[PDB]
Amino acid sequence: QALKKYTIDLTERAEQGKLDPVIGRDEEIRRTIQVLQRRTKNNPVLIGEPGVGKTAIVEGLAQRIINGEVPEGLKGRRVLALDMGALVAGEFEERLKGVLNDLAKQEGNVILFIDALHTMVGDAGNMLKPALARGELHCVGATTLDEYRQYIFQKVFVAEPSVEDTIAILRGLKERYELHHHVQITDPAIVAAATLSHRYIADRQLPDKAIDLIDEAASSIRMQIDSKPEELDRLDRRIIQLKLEQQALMLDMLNEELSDKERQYSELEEEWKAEKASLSGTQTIKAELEQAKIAIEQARRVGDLARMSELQYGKIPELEKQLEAATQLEGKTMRLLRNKVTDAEIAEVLARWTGIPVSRMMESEREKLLRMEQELHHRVIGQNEAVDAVSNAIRRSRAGLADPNRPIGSFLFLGPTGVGKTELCKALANFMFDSDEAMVRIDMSEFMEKHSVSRLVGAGGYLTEAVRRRPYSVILLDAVEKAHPDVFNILLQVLDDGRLTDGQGRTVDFRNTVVIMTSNLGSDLIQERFLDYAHMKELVLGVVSHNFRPEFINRIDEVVVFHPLGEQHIASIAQIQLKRLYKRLEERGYEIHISDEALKLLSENGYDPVYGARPLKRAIQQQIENPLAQQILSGELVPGKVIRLEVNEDRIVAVQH
Ligand SMILES: Nc1ncnc2c1ncn2[C@@H]1O[C@H](COP(=O)(O)OP(=O)(O)O)[C@@H](O)[C@H]1O
Ligand SMILES: Nc1ncnc2c1ncn2[C@@H]1O[C@H](COP(=O)(O)OP(=O)(O)O)[C@@H](O)[C@H]1O
C-alpha cells in the first residue's frame, strides 16, 4: 500500500465533490480517453506549457469516470496522482518498486498520473521501463514539450485557451472561488482578469495567470473586509484626542461634543457588527448550498430516492432563494464593507505586478483614438499625411470595419532618411502599446539569404519568438526591398492569416500587432517632388510596381509617403530634442532658454538632405551638452540662475546674465 503513502486518489476526491469544475477541454478529454483504451502504446501524455490546465484535464477525466460518462471500459477505474514529494522524504528506488507492485496488483483498474513526467525518467528512475511494455502499469503523463523533446506513449497536445475560453473557464470556477474567498466576484472582473493578464503578463500563461489575478484581488478584498473601517478609526482617534484635552483641562462644551461623538461612534460600531453578521450569514448558507449540491451528486451515484427530489425541489432552490435574498440584503445593508471584487481590483493587482500606472490600463480608448493625430503630433513633427493615413487605418481596424484575422495595421513607409519614419513607429508603439519598448525592430539588410528566411522563422526564429513574448508590439521591417524572396511569402502569410506557423509547427498570433515596412526606393522621386499634395502616391506607385507584386500593394492598408523637412520643421525637431536636456536640468534647478539664432545654428548643423535630421541629436550633444557639462562641473554655472544659450562668434555659448 505505497499508494496510500505515495499517491493522491483523484477519483476519490472527485467522488467527494472536492475537485473544482472543469470547463471546456471536451476534445482533449475525449482524446485522452480514446488513447487510454489504446491497443498498444495506450497510455497518453499531456504536453503543454505550465498553467494551461493539463492537470485540469486529468481531474476532468476523473470526474467523468465518477459520473459514469466514460466508455464501459473505463467505468469503475481509479485515477491516482503520484506525488514526487513523498518519495524523496536508496529509499527512492525501493518505494517506487513497491508502488509498481501495488499498481501491478489490481492489473488495470488503476490509472497512474505523473506530473512533470521528465523528473521520474530523465532523477531518471530506470525501473519504470519494464512496466510500460509488460503492461503492469497504465499511466498518463503531464510534461512540457521541451521535456518531451528530452524524453523522445502517445502524444496528446494541450493548447493554451484563448481569452474567450479563459472567460468561460473563470465563469465556471466563479461560484467555487466566491465560496473559497468569502467574496463576490464581478463578471467585469472576470473579463478584465483574462484580458489584462493576456495583454500585460508576457511570461505566464492562460488561464493560470488570470486565475492568479482573481485570487490575489480576492485576498486583497478579504483583508479589506476584516479590517476596521476608516470612519471608526477616525472617530476613535478624534474622541481619544478630545478625551485627552478634556481630562487635561480638569471646559464642559467639549464634554457635550465628546458624548455626541461617542453616540455616533457607538452607532457606527454597531452598524459595523451588523454588516459583518450579514456577510457571515451569506457565506454560511452559500457553503450549505454547495454541500447540498454535492450531496445530490452523491445521491445520483448511490441511488437514494425521495432524497434527490427533496433536494432538487426543496433544499437547493430554497437555499438559492435566500442566498440571493441575502445578497440583495447585502445590497441594502452593505456600506462600510465592500465584498465585491471588480475590474478595478484586478487592475490594482496587475498594477502591483507590472508597474503600469493603471490610469493607462483603463484610460478611455475612444478618446485616445479620436484625438490620435494630436497625440502622434506631440512627438512626430510634420508629416501630416503619414499621421492621417496611420490614424485612419488604425481607427478603421479598432472600429471593427476590417478583417479581424489580419494585423491591426499594415503600412509601407516611403521617403528619404531622417524624416521621422522610425519616429512615427516609436510614437505608435508608445501611443497604443504604452511604450517604445513594445516594438520589434528587424533590419531586412541582414536577411538577404535562404539562411534569412531560416533565421527569422526557424528550421528559434528572431520574429516568432519576439511576437510570442510580446503579442502587442509595433513590428518595424526596415529596408524591406533588400529582403530575400522567400521572406516576402512569410510576410504575406502574416498580412493575411494574421498568424504565422514557425519551423516548430506552432502558430504565432500577429493580430495584435501593427506591421510597418520602410523603403528607400521612392526616395529620389519623392525628394524630386514638391507637384500636388496628392498625385505623389500615383507617381511613386509607378516605382512601387517595379519591385513589388500586386499582392503586396493590395494587402497593405496604406502606402505612406514621407516628405523632406522644412526649416521650421527642423527647428521644432530641435526644440523637442532640447526638451529632455531641459528636463534633466530642471531637476537640478537649472533654467535654460535658447536664442533664436542659436536655435538656427543647431538647425543648420543638424540637417543635411541625405541623412535628414539624424545628425541633430549628437549635433546638440557636441555643441551644447559638452561645454554645458564643462561649466556645470566648473561651478561657473550655478542653479537658481537662468542659463541663456547664445552665439559667440559662430559657436554656441552658455551664459548667466
Ligand atoms: N478547462 C478548465 N476548467 C477549469 N479550470 C481550468 C481549466 N483549465 C485550467 N484550469 C485551471 O488552471 C489552473 C492551473 O492549471 P494546471 O492544471 O496547473 O496547468 P498545468 O498542470 O497544465 O501546468 C488550475 O487551477 C485549473 O483549475
Ligand atoms: N518628423 C520628425 N519628428 C520628430 N523627430 C524627428 C522627425 N524626423 C527626424 N526626427 C529625429 O531624427 C532622428 C532620426 O530620425 P528617424 O526617425 O530615425 O529617421 P528614419 O525613420 O528615416 O530612420 C530621430 O531620433 C528623431 O528624434
Residue numbers in the entry: 159 to 247, 253 to 285, 294 to 323, 333 to 430, 441 to 649, 659 to 729, 732 to 858
Give the exact sentences the study uses for this entry.
ClpB is composed of a N-terminal domain (ND) followed by two AAA+ domains (AAA-1 and AAA-2). The MD confers unique disaggregase ability to ClpB/Hsp104 and is required for species-specific cooperation with the DnaK-DnaJ(DnaKJ)/Hsp70-Hsp40 system.
We determined the crystal structure of an ND truncation of E. coli ClpB (residues 159 to 858; E279A/E432A/E678A mutation). The subunit structure is very similar to that of T. thermophilus ClpB. To interpret the domain interactions, we fitted ClpB atomic coordinates into the EM density. Since none of the available crystal structure conformations fit in the EM map, domains were fitted as separate rigid bodies connected at hinge regions. The pseudo-atomic model of one ClpB subunit obtained from this fitting differs from the crystal structure by rotations about the inter-domain hinge points.
